[PDB]
Design a protein around this ligand. Structure first.
Ligand SMILES: Fc1ccc2nc(Nc3nc(-c4ccccn4)cs3)sc2c1
Ligand SMILES: Fc1ccc2nc(Nc3nc(-c4ccccn4)cs3)sc2c1
Lengths: 193, 193
């Protein structure tokens, strides 16, 4: 039952490490999962639904890790606070580079993927803005830009920059440098002027 | 001759304001340009080549405007310097929102579009880094991050944020706010700490 579903998911994530979703057949996923093609369709309506599920698991993994941090403030300076949070996305998505790259591509063709990404980005931006607001209330950050607009640009920067690094795009920040790069821009723009 | 080509280009840009390239036929472009379908193929091998040409014109328009600024330093403070430069992209791409949105989508399917965008992004990042380097040399900016890595993240932020605003994505910064938002992040991250 659920074993077969997890096997389909594992096959898909493994095959996506070597070629795009368009070059992966339903027969490919069935074979790698040890089932027939009609048995596959019992668990998933299409290979695109498999990717949707894989991406849903990754985004919820990142969201739950961020929720854990928010309930467990690490005892450090403000710079380290932001780094620990950005690192949740660096580590979670960087551990699922194939699903991440495939999910970004599917945003152009799948309404559910686009809506899934949009829902979680709105959640993460709202949390970023709430923390900026708290920092302003306690006197640690200046009241410069509207906090939600700042949070939006910083989160969109992280999306584009992290995914360019993971995919090895040209241009991109080297993966070994991208965390320091983003943290610097977040901290100077949140606390500067 | 060139009149027919410009007519095809104008028809394509007009039709892209209402539906994606996948929903525009070669017959659509021929009809709107007042020519036959075989005559169309004399000027362009495909509708994708039409988009490639449209995007090439827009990116070169932005590049030439930025080159004009670089040769004509406006007499203002450092903040205004950066704003005037970011504004080149805000105005150029914001005046061609349909071609911009279609070109971004084609990056996933067209090697020439992806290489075109990558070439000009590398050029614009190198220029950004050169200006940051000049500001550090004259003593106006601190030596914090590697300038080219900072420039990469700031330019990728601008790409993602401007295009989200133009497309009305959720989430996005309102178009009337995106210039102030980006300028703040550039100036604080280039001159801060
Ligand atoms: F402490 C905090 C509180 C909020 C907070 N928000 C963050 N930014 C985000 N990055 C992404 C993202 C997107 C695509 C790929 C990788 N990452 C989505 S939202 S980092 C952080 C740290
Ligand atoms: F003075 C200067 C010197 C360099 C400089 N570079 C800039 N950034 C760029 N933005 C984009 C972009 C991409 C996609 C959509 C819109 N814009 C490409 S490169 S703004 C600026 C101002």
């Amino acid at each position: 039952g659920d074993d077969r579903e997890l096997a389909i998911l594992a096959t898909a994530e493994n095959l996506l490490e070597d070629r795009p979703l368009a070059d992966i057949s339903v027969d490919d996923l069935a074979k790698g999962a040890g089932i027939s093609r009609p048995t596959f369709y019992f668990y998933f309506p299409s290979k695109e639904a498999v990717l949707l599920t894989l991406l849903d698991r990754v985004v919820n993994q990142a969201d739950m890790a961020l929720q854990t941090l928010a309930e467990n403030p690490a005892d450090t300076d403000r710079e380290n606070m932001w780094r620990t949070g950005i690192n949740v996305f660096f580590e979670t998505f960087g551990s699922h580079k194939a699903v991440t790259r495939a999910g970004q591509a599917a945003r152009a063709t799948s309404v559910e993927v686009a809506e899934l990404w949009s829902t979680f980005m709105q959640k993460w931006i709202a949390y970023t803005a709430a923390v900026i607001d708290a920092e302003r209330d306690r006197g640690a950050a200046p009241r410069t830009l509207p906090a939600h607009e700042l949070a939006t640009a910083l989160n969109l920067m992280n999306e584009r920059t992290l995914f360019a690094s993971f995919a090895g795009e040209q241009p991109s920040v080297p993966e070994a440098r991208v965390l320091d790069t983003l943290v610097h821009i977040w901290v100077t723009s949140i606390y500067g002027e």
